[PDB]
């Protein structure tokens, strides 16, 4: 009759784990008036990033939706955790989970019902210039998938509902064009959001992968993105939300709009959106397409009442599944919006627990990635130590001077150690343990001298001369570099932040033992110095949170061998990456054609035969590892029992009982510590799936052996699921295991793969 | 240092107990931005406006090089961390640095205690023109008393300074002069402030 | 305490250790299920320190006992399955399904931080049935003074069932089940009644 959509909104049913919560949710929603339905599905004014309206007659409170993916933002009495980028570089599932569990503890204890976290594949990593790529994990669907599973799981285990984000193909900040309508001027009158144009194979094999894992972990909610997909807004894209997400991934939860992600009232209601944010928050300036408008739409007949009931059911399922009715979080106390948007006092609460500082330190020590070492590291007992760069010390205005989003300090301000990035996925910091502090402590234990030049080397009088006079007599000189980037903009290039270029130029001029440490949101340009004979070592420490110095120094001095490895590719040039990674245009309808397909990050590099400086999955230790005895055990299979929720992904081998996520075989290999020091090692497995236009290889396993002593061996193990060895058929619209020869490879990086063998299915 | 630091005013804010939110003002609370020995063989060749950090010694032939400086900020933070507290320092020049005044105004109101570190460098070969504080000291104090009513002042100095504008302001709850403590500046001071040892100098 | 601390050995299950030179030594378990605390409770014998007793440096007040019959879940997470027969079996079902969950609140009403082991007991009705059977525990870690925390007890079908000698299967009996919660097997401020059919 009035069937406007090709893909109808399928009704929630609770799926696997939420069956009883669904039943309660459905029971409560059946009692709701139209007015009440519109209340819970649209944002109201409050202290949190977003707030659902109450249903006060049924005892349903307002829900606090709070940023962000490193923990509760705009909040005192909490810890600053390392960014997703940083746990990714650990390649340590245990840490991935524990990080999220601790974030979850602090979320709940601050009063948060829904965490706007984690970032589970949007952005994934199509461009290495993405201003908020740091908020995610790996630039790889498989590893991002595993990290997303565990990040969701840790959060829900603490009682906080997840809003995994951002669905989907949200791969540049530029022209994301959030909806604003204020003082007459709508964004609709200026420029529509960038349209990611994505073929069906790429959408399934690359972008959806990580979101499938988040759905399976039991993410209670999904945030729809700011970009358009094939010229249709993600937040009212029926193929995206109703069929891809809600039918194929069988997603049983709420889709929440990004703030200004909803551009219309009726299409959104019909095409999969469940919650309008921020609604009445932010002065109503980001659109306010539902609320009283949705009451009007339901009463006059243009929007199905039963449709909106399903939205409210989806919202409440999480409330009841995570026990928030009988174990409600305490009140949320801080004004995280900020005046003049919201005038309101803040209270105070301290939720930092014993063990959380130590966890953050250990994420740092496990992730700091050794890129170059000619023999200067580890340090022994050097007696004269020079340090360079404002990154080695505090923000001169204080660790939280840049404000609620870590983005409001002046362009030239010396921000100190880059412990996190800019925007909604940052957080405040109770202190920063600077590299200089931690280096000085150790210097004092060795009875040594230490001095730091931490000013701006270009604009501060006497700074060049001070560096010239300091460095020649130092036994080692450390240069701390950074590169701030943020939500709402892309990096213009790979250039270092602040005076980093000039610090390096001076450092190599006046010293022959330069050790470089980079705190960064992404890949940077060190081409001018990485082959300089005076640069004896290089490391990337990413975004380590509050324990920056004390996580780093034990690695530098050899108390623990570095074991982190790169979660994306480090190319020699921006021109080496996927082309048109960020489209810059004033065109009304900006387009980004994803003509590269599945070939992003290392898959582009491998396919094009381009050699990166440092490949995906690369990191040195202070010892070496030898790989041997590759075994593929087709006898070691297992039915998939342990997911929280199940997808409905079609696949050719379906027989009514089995699944896409059953393990069909397991692969093993042996590593031997073949050097002079104890060291941990991340072993990686890659599969070459046969076919036309197939990546040379795709990561399908990792296993980190901890503290393997000299001359000892360990077995490394890699369970392989049916999906891990499958392809998407566009024609048949299902997953299948193709025919041909699969190359299975194992080793220490994407291009150091000493073990290979062949598997031929039938 | 711990035997010399001299308590001049105490309205009852000292000794500290276990303050949970701590604000720190003054470049004197942290390092010389060019390094402890940046000012050369006689501690006197740094530019007139350079932020020299903690004044641990004076200028001239009576100076000496330093293997490190244990800054007041380092020592205060160590104790704050032991108390599960938070701590933030504004250590730029408060007059000439963009946003510095606004950072101070936003930080101080919610702090349980606000430490202000001031200094006054003087040297061999010239006499001080007056008692005025070095660098931005006057401005730091004006801002501090505007936004906090638990201001603890610590002065590193080569002599008497002019604190008349603020000495009788009841927002200044304590004043201490620490003279020139040498390399162990911060770790001599903080145990006095927290009452592990009573101040004892005169 | 993980067992009952009686004032005398004579207060425990009789013939607890049998001493004979007889060729075929016998230990008749005629006490039945009544061992440790359920012997003391059934016989009205007062121990010195009861099963589940232990002091803190603070005290805890219990409140707000809730029985939530909508907080149920299929047993999916066990590594292996039994084949224990039960009367309520409908082919899609299990003895270890959680059929309801119960909650209560503890408040640190003393003068120091402390951890509290909250315990749940159930009087399952029937002939010659224990006074109380432990069916839950939850240890709250480091509860600050004045703060509260919710305590959570999932209840499986098995947890509320009896064995039928005649039918040779588990079953949930008819009658009144008392659900008690508190700090020991004899310190149970909260109680409520559940009646199935
Ligand atoms: C954004 O835009 C992109 C680009 O338009 C969207 O992509 C499209 O998504 C569609 C589905 O949503 C895909 O439709 C399928 O098309 C199948 C035939 O595909 C061939 O035909 C066209 C010819 O013009 C061509 O584009 C395709 O070329 C691509 O794929 C090949 C193979 O990899 C590559 O070599 C090329 O380079 C291109 O990449 C193909 O050659 C069609 O068979 C399929 O079948 C139907 O499925 C539906 C839904 O279930 C069903 O209603 C139908 O009945 C039918 O299924 C029947 O047949 C099969 C057995 O044959 C059986 O299993 C079923 O049970 C049933 O009996 C479907 O129509 C479209 O190909 C795809 N295009 C591209 C270029 O990727 C993307 O979705 C958009 N995204 C968003 C978010 O909106
Ligand atoms: C300490 O920490 C500080 C923060 O706490 C740091 O300060 C911040 O530093 C960042 C960069 O590091 C700086 O970023 C912005 O600077 C200005 C601010 O107004 C912007 O121009 C920049 O955005 C543009 O440039 C980007 C790259 O070229 C791009 O990704 C972005 O999208 C944007 O470009 C658009 O705008 C242009 C129009 O003028 C077009 O030419 C361009 O093609 C793009 O057009 C799109 O958008 C237009 C809308 O305006 C539209 O017209 C058009 O159609 C199209 O859609 C850049 O993000 C922060 O401002 C700065 N913060 C402050 C407060 O100063 C500090 O650097 C750090 N210190 C150190 C030492 O690192
Ligand atoms: C639609 O949502 C709005 C916003 O949530 C509802 O109004 C709000 O209702 C809540 C009660 O659920 C009020 O909060 C309460 O305040 C009292 C003290 O007055 C306190 O004791 C309670 O613990 C609770 O915090 C809140 O004041 C009120 N807000 C506003 C702006 O009016 C509204 O009732 C919802 N409508 C329907 C039909 O349910
Ligand atoms: C930091 O120390 C420098 C010297 O190392 C101070 O600069 C001198 O200040 C005196 C006045 O006391 C002038 O007469 C000298 O000419 C200055 N010397 C030079 C070389 O410029 C400087 O004032 C100190 N900084 C602060 C903020 O007090
Ligand atoms: C129903 O109400 C909405 C908003 O008030 C309006 O946009 C829409 O046109 C109305 N429909 C009819 C048939 O009047
Ligand atoms: C390396 O350092 C020395 C001084 O230590 C300098 O003379 C030389 O030019 C430097 N070389 C390069 C390539 O930077
Ligand atoms: C995107 O693809 C279409 C063909 O599908 C092409 O005509 C269009 O111009 C492309 N856009 C850009 C910006 O190249
Ligand atoms: C003292 O501080 C308060 C703010 O804490 C301010 O309102 C008041 O004006 C100050 N008084 C003086 C005399 O400086
Ligand atoms: C044990 O039970 C049997 C009957 O079942 C009884 O005849 C026998 O005497 C008992 N033995 C002892 C040692 O009490």
Numbering used by the authors:
A (entry chain A): 43 to 804
B (entry chain B): 406 to 607
C (entry chain C): 608 to 804
Publication excerpt:
The first 43 residues were missing in the electron density map, partially supporting the existence of the KEX27 cleavage site (Ile32Phe33Arg34Arg35). The structure of the four monomers are essentially same without any remarkable difference. Domain 3 (residue 664–803) is connected to domain 2 by linker 2 (residue 601–663) and has a fibronectin type III (FnIII) fold. Seven Asn residues (81, 272, 342, 385, 457, 576, and 635) are found to link with different types of oligosaccharide even after treated by endoglycosidase H. In LXYL-P1-2 structure, the distance of these two residues is 5.5 Å, consistent with the proposed retaining catalytic mechanism in GH3 family.
Each monomer comprises three domains as some GH3 members. Sequence alignment of LXYL-P1-2 indicates that Asp300 and Glu529 might act as the catalytic nucleophile and the acid/base residues, respectively.
